[PDB]
Design a protein around this ligand. Structure first.
Ligand SMILES: CC(=O)N[C@@H]1[C@@H](O)[C@@H](F)[C@@](OP(=O)(O)OC[C@H]2O[C@@H](n3ccc(N)nc3=O)[C@H](O)[C@@H]2O)(C(=O)O)O[C@H]1[C@@H](O)[C@H](O)CO
Ligand SMILES: OC[C@H]1O[C@@H](O[C@H]2[C@H](O)[C@@H](O)[C@H](O)O[C@@H]2CO)[C@H](O)[C@@H](O)[C@H]1O
Length: 377
């Protein structure tokens, strides 16, 4: 029996966790690993120190068939330790199961490790508030059984379908927010159902690595000393955080970057509605997929130090380089951001709002919206 480990994720959070897992095991230079990480590129130098390390592309939330050629290379009885992104867990496992059916005799699933895509699971879960959770579960179990037995996907409730994997494999979830599952009364049935198969993402796990591994991890998440240094200055610092849109329409995209830029000013300008004072060193932490959006801020802002968008915000917390204040559009990094560092959360009633509230990330006060801010200048 050989154990192949798969790390798959099209987003950020999962990847950050999966690579942390990988780091914790970097002593084992020859364990068969398959990385399917869209937002992270493992540096060659790290690659050449490992054996039986493969890479697979992701398309439409699923590993391409290149994954099959990989598996083909291991003829013995193999067991799969799969790490997946919760939100797209059903699609991400599709070709794994497909290949499995082509080899029931040899291939088997050892266990699953699922991680939150980000805020989506929570926004999506908030939309299931008036439903019979208990019923929803059983319904989902049965449909997963159908999926596992036919290779066919058909879920009445896609959101709930994400949390019924225990009915088929040994699994452990890692939640961006365990508080949400314990504070949303309407979720009790899912809470209880999940019983002991879950835990909170451990953000202090980097502190437990040996310094060498820490450097190693930092290498994976693309954190360099140059950036490390732009954060060394003893001056009080403020990190404007960016967001983005998935819409292609040039119109909606330009509007986003224009709203964001303007929001940036309400923070930094003295007549801004969100003015935080004038002694802070401003920095920009654009969304990873910011693209033209991130460029806009840098091309029209003044004295601001850019923090490479490909670096996930949670890394500043691990390396203790967190600033005094953070402000911008709502996104997943605020779910794990030390309370006292919150300057203000702006949104683009509203589910995302309800989640922030249930979690106490924001107070009872009037939530601020993108467009309620006057154009400055
Ligand atoms: C509801 C919904 O669909 N939420 C998703 C969420 O499940 C996930 F898909 C993601 O996560 P998102 O919350 O933005 O943030 C996720 C992580 O990405 C890195 N980050 C993000 C912004 C930034 N300015 N600096 C950073 O460094 C951090 O690691 C952070 O914790 C995502 O794109 O990965 O995007 C949002 C979308 O709402 C999109 O943001 C808005 O249309
Ligand atoms: O990148 C991970 C991220 O993808 C989001 O989906 C986007 C996709 O990335 C983009 O290329 C396409 O044009 O639009 C999709 C949304 O309609 C997921 O929603 C998010 O959860 C992550 O998986």
């Amino acid at each position: 029996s050989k154990t192949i480990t798969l790390y798959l994720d099209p987003a950020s959070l999962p990847a950050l966790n999966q690579l942390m897992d990988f780091t914790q095991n970097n002593e084992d230079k020859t364990h068969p690993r398959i990385f399917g990480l869209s937002r992270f590129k493992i540096p060659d130098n790290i690659i050449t120190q490992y054996q039986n390390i493969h890479f697979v592309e992701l398309k439409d939330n699923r590993p391409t068939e290149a994954l099959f050629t990989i598996l083909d290379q291991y003829p013995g009885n193999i067991e799969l330790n799969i790490h997946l992104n919760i939100a797209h867990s059903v699609q991400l496992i599709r070709p794994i199961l497909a290949y499995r059916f082509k080899h029931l005799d040899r291939v088997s699933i050892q266990q699953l490790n699922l991680y939150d895509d980000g805020s989506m699971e929570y926004v999506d879960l908030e939309k299931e508030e008036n439903k019979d959770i208990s019923a929803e579960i059983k319904q989902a179990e049965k449909q997963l059984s159908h999926y596992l037995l036919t290779g066919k996907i058909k879920f009445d409730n896609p959101t709930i379908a994400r949390y019924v994997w225990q009915s088929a494999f040994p699994v452990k979830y890692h939640f961006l927010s365990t508080d949400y599952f314990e504070k949303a009364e309407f979720l009790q049935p899912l809470k209880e159902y999940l019983a002991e198969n879950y835990q909170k993402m451990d953000w202090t796990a980097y502190q437990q690595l040996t310094p060498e591994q820490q450097a190693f991890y930092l290498t994976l998440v693309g954190f360099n000393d140059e950036v490390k240094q732009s954060l060394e200055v003893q001056q009080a610092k403020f990190i404007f955080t960016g967001t983005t849109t998935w819409e292609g329409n040039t119109e909606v995209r330009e509007y986003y970057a224009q709203q964001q830029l303007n929001l940036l000013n309400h923070f930094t300008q003295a007549e801004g509605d969100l003015f935080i004072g004038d002694h802070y060193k401003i920095y920009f932490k654009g969304h990873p997929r910011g693209g033209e959006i991130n460029d806009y801020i840098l091309n029209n802002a003044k004295n601001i130090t850019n923090i490479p968008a490909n670096i996930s915000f949670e890394v500043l917390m691990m390396t203790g380089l967190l600033p005094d204040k953070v402000g911008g559009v709502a996104s997943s990094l605020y779910f794990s951001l030390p309370k006292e560092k919150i300057s203000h959360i702006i949104f683009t009633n509203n589910p995302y709002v309800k989640v922030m509230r249930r979690l106490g990330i924001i107070d009872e006060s009037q939530v601020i919206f993108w467009d309620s801010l006057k154009e400055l200048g």
